[PDB]
Amino acid sequence: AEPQPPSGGLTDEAALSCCSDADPSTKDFLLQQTMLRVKDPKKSLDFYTRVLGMTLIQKCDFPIMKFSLYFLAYEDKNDIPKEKDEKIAWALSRKATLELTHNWGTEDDETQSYHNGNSDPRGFGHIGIAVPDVYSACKRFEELGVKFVKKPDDGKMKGLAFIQDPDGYWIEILNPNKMATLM
Amino acid sequence: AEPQPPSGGLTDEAALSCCSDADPSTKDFLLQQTMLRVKDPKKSLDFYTRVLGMTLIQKCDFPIMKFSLYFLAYEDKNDIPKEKDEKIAWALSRKATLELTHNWGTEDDETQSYHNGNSDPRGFGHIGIAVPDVYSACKRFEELGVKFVKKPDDGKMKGLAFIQDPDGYWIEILNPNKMATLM
Ligand SMILES: COc1ccc(/C=C(\CC(=O)O)c2nc3ccccc3s2)cc1
Ligand SMILES: COc1ccc(/C=C(\CC(=O)O)c2nc3ccccc3s2)cc1
Ligand SMILES: [Zn+2]
Ligand SMILES: [Zn+2]
């Protein structure tokens, strides 16, 4: 009922009082995809497959509306079913996929670019890739012409990097075993 | 090369010639996180845990810079290590996590809202949750006061839904076994 002084962040206890246990109706839900719009799928496919080691697991074309969907994931290309319906059902039940939306023609348009969400207006910030070694990964990214937002040892938090994809989306490069030393 | 008629997107063959096999240096890379900025973590935690059945697996507070990070995932809460360093290392090596960024004070600012990327300027579009039954999941979402962008049987592609979270970010609700029927 009383006005309170500026809280600050939530306490661990406040955050937890806002959390409910998983209802049994949600028990088989999984976080399947993140969708990003890409100007030029040729550049995006080369980046995500060659630079980041992802596999293209499904491509969907919509001839009438004139757009394509590309699903990228860290999956063994030998696990991709060969039959069309089984393939789509396997691809779209993989956890942690990246869905790239290509609105046909944007690749031919000098002015068009997508917004990465890290300048006004902000919202989405980044995807993040966990790697065994941020320094070796980033050395290879440098050699392959990758643009950096943050080199691993530049700024406050060392051993953490941000690169950008061909559309300028930020990608965090993190070692899960080194994040405790920043927290 | 000669000037071409308007883009028909890539052929399956063109898309494949833009893909490289995974370099051995990337072999342990995994798509770990998607980061979204949230105005009010009380509302976002309630939505992602109670409505969507995700588990809060890690909370990080930065008292001096004045922001919190919340990591949400489809994980069994009994798998969360209890000790701080082992917990962070386990949380930040989970596939398919959602990272919510709370810039302290945004919850106390009448005017402030984040941009969902689905109006100018566009980029990020959505996350997507794979569910065993889109219609039962959506019936429950309706009963829980969830705002819809697309009801499963509205629009051209039926059996697919979009809801929005408390910040207005779009969330696709999909059955992997029904997506082949939309191609
Ligand atoms: C663009 O520059 C930066 C530099 C550091 C960060 C810090 C991050 C990444 C993020 O905020 O998403 C950190 N994340 C974690 C997660 C766990 C433990 C410590 C950190 S610091 C973010 C952006
Ligand atoms: C906002 O309204 C819609 C309605 C349908 C769609 C269609 C989608 C979702 C998307 O574009 O990410 C489809 N995704 C797939 C994936 C595989 C096969 C078919 C489809 S249709 C998108 C937005
Ligand atoms: Zn989607
Ligand atoms: Zn992050």
PDB file of all heavy atoms in Angstrom, chain B residues 3-4 12 21 28 33 53 66 73 76 80-81 88 92 99 105 108 116 124 129 134 138 141 152 155 164 166:
ATOM      1  N   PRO B   3      22.054  -9.400 -66.524  1.00  0.00           N
ATOM      2  CA  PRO B   3      21.017  -9.036 -65.554  1.00  0.00           C
ATOM      3  C   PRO B   3      19.891 -10.088 -65.573  1.00  0.00           C
ATOM      4  O   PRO B   3      19.595 -10.603 -66.640  1.00  0.00           O
ATOM      5  CB  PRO B   3      20.538  -7.652 -66.014  1.00  0.00           C
ATOM      6  CG  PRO B   3      20.902  -7.591 -67.501  1.00  0.00           C
ATOM      7  CD  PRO B   3      22.120  -8.477 -67.671  1.00  0.00           C
ATOM      8  N   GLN B   4      19.352 -10.436 -64.398  1.00  0.00           N
ATOM      9  CA  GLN B   4      18.405 -11.568 -64.233  1.00  0.00           C
ATOM     10  C   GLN B   4      17.009 -11.016 -63.977  1.00  0.00           C
ATOM     11  O   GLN B   4      16.880  -9.878 -63.528  1.00  0.00           O
ATOM     12  CB  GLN B   4      18.870 -12.485 -63.099  1.00  0.00           C
ATOM     13  CG  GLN B   4      20.231 -13.115 -63.340  1.00  0.00           C
ATOM     14  CD  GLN B   4      20.255 -13.901 -64.632  1.00  0.00           C
ATOM     15  OE1 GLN B   4      21.302 -14.336 -65.107  1.00  0.00           O
ATOM     16  NE2 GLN B   4      19.087 -14.085 -65.225  1.00  0.00           N
ATOM     17  N   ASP B  12      17.029 -25.714 -54.049  1.00  0.00           N
ATOM     18  CA  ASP B  12      17.614 -26.647 -53.055  1.00  0.00           C
ATOM     19  C   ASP B  12      19.096 -26.835 -53.399  1.00  0.00           C
ATOM     20  O   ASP B  12      19.937 -26.886 -52.455  1.00  0.00           O
ATOM     21  CB  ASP B  12      16.845 -27.968 -53.006  1.00  0.00           C
ATOM     22  CG  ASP B  12      15.498 -27.875 -52.305  1.00  0.00           C
ATOM     23  OD1 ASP B  12      15.136 -26.775 -51.825  1.00  0.00           O
ATOM     24  OD2 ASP B  12      14.813 -28.909 -52.242  1.00  0.00           O
ATOM     25  N   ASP B  21      30.330 -28.362 -44.964  1.00  0.00           N
ATOM     26  CA  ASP B  21      30.347 -29.334 -43.841  1.00  0.00           C
ATOM     27  C   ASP B  21      31.002 -28.673 -42.626  1.00  0.00           C
ATOM     28  O   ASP B  21      31.842 -27.774 -42.823  1.00  0.00           O
ATOM     29  CB  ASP B  21      31.058 -30.627 -44.248  1.00  0.00           C
ATOM     30  CG  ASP B  21      30.271 -31.449 -45.254  1.00  0.00           C
ATOM     31  OD1 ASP B  21      29.064 -31.154 -45.457  1.00  0.00           O
ATOM     32  OD2 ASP B  21      30.873 -32.350 -45.843  1.00  0.00           O
ATOM     33  N   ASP B  28      32.016 -29.086 -31.125  1.00  0.00           N
ATOM     34  CA  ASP B  28      31.301 -29.051 -29.817  1.00  0.00           C
ATOM     35  C   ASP B  28      30.482 -27.755 -29.664  1.00  0.00           C
ATOM     36  O   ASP B  28      29.969 -27.515 -28.548  1.00  0.00           O
ATOM     37  CB  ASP B  28      32.292 -29.286 -28.668  1.00  0.00           C
ATOM     38  CG  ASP B  28      32.928 -30.680 -28.730  1.00  0.00           C
ATOM     39  OD1 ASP B  28      32.176 -31.673 -28.715  1.00  0.00           O
ATOM     40  OD2 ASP B  28      34.162 -30.775 -28.861  1.00  0.00           O
ATOM     41  N   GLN B  33      21.652 -19.869 -26.386  1.00  0.00           N
ATOM     42  CA  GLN B  33      20.725 -18.831 -25.881  1.00  0.00           C
ATOM     43  C   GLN B  33      20.163 -17.964 -27.005  1.00  0.00           C
ATOM     44  O   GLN B  33      20.816 -17.795 -28.032  1.00  0.00           O
ATOM     45  CB  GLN B  33      21.411 -17.929 -24.859  1.00  0.00           C
ATOM     46  CG  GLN B  33      22.731 -17.385 -25.331  1.00  0.00           C
ATOM     47  CD  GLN B  33      23.323 -16.395 -24.363  1.00  0.00           C
ATOM     48  OE1 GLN B  33      23.416 -15.225 -24.685  1.00  0.00           O
ATOM     49  NE2 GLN B  33      23.775 -16.859 -23.203  1.00  0.00           N
ATOM     50  N   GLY B  53       5.555 -23.144 -19.055  1.00  0.00           N
ATOM     51  CA  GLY B  53       6.147 -24.306 -18.354  1.00  0.00           C
ATOM     52  C   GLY B  53       7.659 -24.383 -18.438  1.00  0.00           C
ATOM     53  O   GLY B  53       8.250 -25.503 -18.240  1.00  0.00           O
ATOM     54  N   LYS B  66      23.670  -2.227 -12.913  1.00  0.00           N
ATOM     55  CA  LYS B  66      22.195  -2.128 -12.666  1.00  0.00           C
ATOM     56  C   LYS B  66      21.386  -2.864 -13.758  1.00  0.00           C
ATOM     57  O   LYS B  66      20.529  -2.247 -14.430  1.00  0.00           O
ATOM     58  CB  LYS B  66      21.734  -0.672 -12.576  1.00  0.00           C
ATOM     59  CG  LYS B  66      22.196   0.105 -11.348  1.00  0.00           C
ATOM     60  CD  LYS B  66      21.715   1.542 -11.403  1.00  0.00           C
ATOM     61  CE  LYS B  66      22.379   2.441 -10.390  1.00  0.00           C
ATOM     62  NZ  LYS B  66      21.801   2.248  -9.043  1.00  0.00           N
ATOM     63  N   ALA B  73      14.578 -22.274 -19.396  1.00  0.00           N
ATOM     64  CA  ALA B  73      14.784 -23.460 -20.241  1.00  0.00           C
ATOM     65  C   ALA B  73      13.760 -24.533 -19.899  1.00  0.00           C
ATOM     66  O   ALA B  73      13.223 -24.560 -18.783  1.00  0.00           O
ATOM     67  CB  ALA B  73      16.204 -23.958 -20.066  1.00  0.00           C
ATOM     68  N   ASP B  76      14.248 -30.099 -16.214  1.00  0.00           N
ATOM     69  CA  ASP B  76      13.724 -30.618 -14.927  1.00  0.00           C
ATOM     70  C   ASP B  76      14.410 -29.844 -13.799  1.00  0.00           C
ATOM     71  O   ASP B  76      15.656 -29.876 -13.720  1.00  0.00           O
ATOM     72  CB  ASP B  76      13.956 -32.127 -14.875  1.00  0.00           C
ATOM     73  CG  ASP B  76      13.448 -32.833 -13.626  1.00  0.00           C
ATOM     74  OD1 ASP B  76      13.409 -32.210 -12.547  1.00  0.00           O
ATOM     75  OD2 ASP B  76      13.057 -34.006 -13.774  1.00  0.00           O
ATOM     76  N   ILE B  80      19.001 -29.041 -11.775  1.00  0.00           N
ATOM     77  CA  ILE B  80      19.736 -27.768 -11.518  1.00  0.00           C
ATOM     78  C   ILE B  80      20.723 -28.014 -10.371  1.00  0.00           C
ATOM     79  O   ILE B  80      20.300 -28.185  -9.238  1.00  0.00           O
ATOM     80  CB  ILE B  80      18.770 -26.620 -11.155  1.00  0.00           C
ATOM     81  CG1 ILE B  80      17.666 -26.362 -12.185  1.00  0.00           C
ATOM     82  CG2 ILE B  80      19.576 -25.369 -10.878  1.00  0.00           C
ATOM     83  CD1 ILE B  80      16.582 -25.424 -11.687  1.00  0.00           C
ATOM     84  N   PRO B  81      22.059 -28.019 -10.580  1.00  0.00           N
ATOM     85  CA  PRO B  81      22.981 -28.165  -9.456  1.00  0.00           C
ATOM     86  C   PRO B  81      22.691 -27.114  -8.372  1.00  0.00           C
ATOM     87  O   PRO B  81      22.220 -26.043  -8.736  1.00  0.00           O
ATOM     88  CB  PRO B  81      24.356 -27.956 -10.096  1.00  0.00           C
ATOM     89  CG  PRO B  81      24.157 -28.352 -11.554  1.00  0.00           C
ATOM     90  CD  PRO B  81      22.745 -27.867 -11.871  1.00  0.00           C
ATOM     91  N   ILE B  88      25.962 -22.445 -12.682  1.00  0.00           N
ATOM     92  CA  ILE B  88      26.126 -21.459 -13.783  1.00  0.00           C
ATOM     93  C   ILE B  88      26.673 -22.224 -14.981  1.00  0.00           C
ATOM     94  O   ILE B  88      26.167 -22.003 -16.095  1.00  0.00           O
ATOM     95  CB  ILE B  88      27.019 -20.263 -13.363  1.00  0.00           C
ATOM     96  CG1 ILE B  88      26.333 -19.380 -12.322  1.00  0.00           C
ATOM     97  CG2 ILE B  88      27.402 -19.424 -14.573  1.00  0.00           C
ATOM     98  CD1 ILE B  88      27.249 -18.366 -11.627  1.00  0.00           C
ATOM     99  N   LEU B  92      24.499 -22.543 -18.425  1.00  0.00           N
ATOM    100  CA  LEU B  92      25.017 -21.834 -19.618  1.00  0.00           C
ATOM    101  C   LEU B  92      25.631 -22.828 -20.605  1.00  0.00           C
ATOM    102  O   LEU B  92      26.119 -22.387 -21.637  1.00  0.00           O
ATOM    103  CB  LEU B  92      25.997 -20.752 -19.164  1.00  0.00           C
ATOM    104  CG  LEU B  92      25.315 -19.407 -18.938  1.00  0.00           C
ATOM    105  CD1 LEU B  92      24.288 -19.468 -17.833  1.00  0.00           C
ATOM    106  CD2 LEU B  92      26.323 -18.341 -18.613  1.00  0.00           C
ATOM    107  N   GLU B  99      17.291 -16.073 -22.549  1.00  0.00           N
ATOM    108  CA  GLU B  99      17.958 -15.104 -21.646  1.00  0.00           C
ATOM    109  C   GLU B  99      17.131 -13.815 -21.644  1.00  0.00           C
ATOM    110  O   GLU B  99      16.989 -13.213 -22.688  1.00  0.00           O
ATOM    111  CB  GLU B  99      19.410 -14.889 -22.040  1.00  0.00           C
ATOM    112  CG  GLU B  99      20.063 -13.749 -21.258  1.00  0.00           C
ATOM    113  CD  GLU B  99      21.424 -13.301 -21.735  1.00  0.00           C
ATOM    114  OE1 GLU B  99      22.014 -14.009 -22.538  1.00  0.00           O
ATOM    115  OE2 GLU B  99      21.879 -12.227 -21.328  1.00  0.00           O
ATOM    116  N   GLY B 105      14.726  -0.474 -13.520  1.00  0.00           N
ATOM    117  CA  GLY B 105      13.993   0.807 -13.559  1.00  0.00           C
ATOM    118  C   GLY B 105      12.981   0.840 -14.686  1.00  0.00           C
ATOM    119  O   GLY B 105      12.017   1.586 -14.564  1.00  0.00           O
ATOM    120  N   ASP B 108       9.342   0.898 -13.936  1.00  0.00           N
ATOM    121  CA  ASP B 108       8.825   2.114 -13.238  1.00  0.00           C
ATOM    122  C   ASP B 108       8.646   3.271 -14.226  1.00  0.00           C
ATOM    123  O   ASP B 108       8.403   4.414 -13.764  1.00  0.00           O
ATOM    124  CB  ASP B 108       9.784   2.530 -12.119  1.00  0.00           C
ATOM    125  CG  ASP B 108       9.867   1.493 -11.026  1.00  0.00           C
ATOM    126  OD1 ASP B 108       8.816   0.860 -10.756  1.00  0.00           O
ATOM    127  OD2 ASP B 108      10.976   1.303 -10.488  1.00  0.00           O
ATOM    128  N   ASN B 116       9.330  -5.482 -30.800  1.00  0.00           N
ATOM    129  CA  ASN B 116       9.241  -6.949 -30.992  1.00  0.00           C
ATOM    130  C   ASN B 116       9.851  -7.361 -32.334  1.00  0.00           C
ATOM    131  O   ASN B 116       9.893  -8.577 -32.609  1.00  0.00           O
ATOM    132  CB  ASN B 116       7.817  -7.460 -30.783  1.00  0.00           C
ATOM    133  CG  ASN B 116       6.814  -7.030 -31.823  1.00  0.00           C
ATOM    134  OD1 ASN B 116       7.172  -6.519 -32.864  1.00  0.00           O
ATOM    135  ND2 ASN B 116       5.551  -7.303 -31.566  1.00  0.00           N
ATOM    136  N   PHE B 124      14.641  -9.577 -35.961  1.00  0.00           N
ATOM    137  CA  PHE B 124      14.103 -10.682 -35.135  1.00  0.00           C
ATOM    138  C   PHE B 124      12.584 -10.739 -35.336  1.00  0.00           C
ATOM    139  O   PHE B 124      11.936  -9.684 -35.440  1.00  0.00           O
ATOM    140  CB  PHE B 124      14.449 -10.463 -33.659  1.00  0.00           C
ATOM    141  CG  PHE B 124      13.715 -11.371 -32.706  1.00  0.00           C
ATOM    142  CD1 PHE B 124      14.136 -12.680 -32.495  1.00  0.00           C
ATOM    143  CD2 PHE B 124      12.586 -10.933 -32.040  1.00  0.00           C
ATOM    144  CE1 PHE B 124      13.450 -13.515 -31.626  1.00  0.00           C
ATOM    145  CE2 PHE B 124      11.887 -11.774 -31.188  1.00  0.00           C
ATOM    146  CZ  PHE B 124      12.355 -13.044 -30.944  1.00  0.00           C
ATOM    147  N   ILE B 129       7.858 -22.487 -29.852  1.00  0.00           N
ATOM    148  CA  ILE B 129       7.709 -23.633 -28.923  1.00  0.00           C
ATOM    149  C   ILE B 129       7.013 -24.744 -29.696  1.00  0.00           C
ATOM    150  O   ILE B 129       5.884 -24.494 -30.156  1.00  0.00           O
ATOM    151  CB  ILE B 129       6.884 -23.262 -27.671  1.00  0.00           C
ATOM    152  CG1 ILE B 129       7.292 -21.942 -27.011  1.00  0.00           C
ATOM    153  CG2 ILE B 129       6.880 -24.429 -26.691  1.00  0.00           C
ATOM    154  CD1 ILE B 129       8.661 -21.942 -26.442  1.00  0.00           C
ATOM    155  N   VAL B 134      -1.431 -28.246 -30.643  1.00  0.00           N
ATOM    156  CA  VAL B 134      -1.554 -26.773 -30.746  1.00  0.00           C
ATOM    157  C   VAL B 134      -2.924 -26.340 -30.192  1.00  0.00           C
ATOM    158  O   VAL B 134      -2.964 -25.275 -29.534  1.00  0.00           O
ATOM    159  CB  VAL B 134      -1.301 -26.289 -32.182  1.00  0.00           C
ATOM    160  CG1 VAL B 134      -1.683 -24.833 -32.353  1.00  0.00           C
ATOM    161  CG2 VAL B 134       0.162 -26.524 -32.563  1.00  0.00           C
ATOM    162  N   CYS B 138      -3.375 -23.947 -26.952  1.00  0.00           N
ATOM    163  CA  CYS B 138      -4.020 -22.626 -27.220  1.00  0.00           C
ATOM    164  C   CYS B 138      -5.302 -22.442 -26.410  1.00  0.00           C
ATOM    165  O   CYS B 138      -5.524 -21.320 -25.941  1.00  0.00           O
ATOM    166  CB  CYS B 138      -4.269 -22.425 -28.706  1.00  0.00           C
ATOM    167  SG  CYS B 138      -2.699 -22.118 -29.549  1.00  0.00           S
ATOM    168  N   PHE B 141      -4.050 -21.435 -23.160  1.00  0.00           N
ATOM    169  CA  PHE B 141      -3.517 -20.048 -23.250  1.00  0.00           C
ATOM    170  C   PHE B 141      -4.707 -19.076 -23.172  1.00  0.00           C
ATOM    171  O   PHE B 141      -4.632 -18.104 -22.410  1.00  0.00           O
ATOM    172  CB  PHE B 141      -2.630 -19.860 -24.476  1.00  0.00           C
ATOM    173  CG  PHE B 141      -1.373 -20.685 -24.569  1.00  0.00           C
ATOM    174  CD1 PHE B 141      -0.833 -20.986 -25.811  1.00  0.00           C
ATOM    175  CD2 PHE B 141      -0.704 -21.132 -23.442  1.00  0.00           C
ATOM    176  CE1 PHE B 141       0.320 -21.753 -25.927  1.00  0.00           C
ATOM    177  CE2 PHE B 141       0.455 -21.889 -23.554  1.00  0.00           C
ATOM    178  CZ  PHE B 141       0.971 -22.201 -24.800  1.00  0.00           C
ATOM    179  N   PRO B 152      -4.894 -20.526 -33.910  1.00  0.00           N
ATOM    180  CA  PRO B 152      -4.495 -21.633 -34.767  1.00  0.00           C
ATOM    181  C   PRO B 152      -5.294 -21.749 -36.074  1.00  0.00           C
ATOM    182  O   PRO B 152      -4.679 -22.134 -37.045  1.00  0.00           O
ATOM    183  CB  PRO B 152      -4.685 -22.893 -33.914  1.00  0.00           C
ATOM    184  CG  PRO B 152      -5.212 -22.434 -32.558  1.00  0.00           C
ATOM    185  CD  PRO B 152      -5.090 -20.929 -32.509  1.00  0.00           C
ATOM    186  N   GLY B 155      -6.239 -17.227 -40.429  1.00  0.00           N
ATOM    187  CA  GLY B 155      -5.235 -16.986 -41.487  1.00  0.00           C
ATOM    188  C   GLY B 155      -5.106 -18.180 -42.415  1.00  0.00           C
ATOM    189  O   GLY B 155      -5.845 -19.166 -42.229  1.00  0.00           O
ATOM    190  N   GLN B 164       1.721 -13.665 -27.730  1.00  0.00           N
ATOM    191  CA  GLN B 164       2.759 -12.678 -27.371  1.00  0.00           C
ATOM    192  C   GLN B 164       2.989 -12.744 -25.867  1.00  0.00           C
ATOM    193  O   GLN B 164       2.085 -13.119 -25.114  1.00  0.00           O
ATOM    194  CB  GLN B 164       2.398 -11.300 -27.909  1.00  0.00           C
ATOM    195  CG  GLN B 164       1.155 -10.708 -27.266  1.00  0.00           C
ATOM    196  CD  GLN B 164       0.782  -9.459 -28.021  1.00  0.00           C
ATOM    197  OE1 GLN B 164       0.618  -9.510 -29.233  1.00  0.00           O
ATOM    198  NE2 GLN B 164       0.707  -8.336 -27.317  1.00  0.00           N
ATOM    199  N   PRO B 166       4.507 -10.820 -22.235  1.00  0.00           N
ATOM    200  CA  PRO B 166       4.209  -9.514 -21.639  1.00  0.00           C
ATOM    201  C   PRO B 166       4.902  -8.310 -22.306  1.00  0.00           C
ATOM    202  O   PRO B 166       4.385  -7.215 -22.204  1.00  0.00           O
ATOM    203  CB  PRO B 166       4.689  -9.700 -20.205  1.00  0.00           C
ATOM    204  CG  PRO B 166       4.558 -11.189 -19.946  1.00  0.00           C
ATOM    205  CD  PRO B 166       4.962 -11.825 -21.258  1.00  0.00           C
TER     206      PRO B 166
END
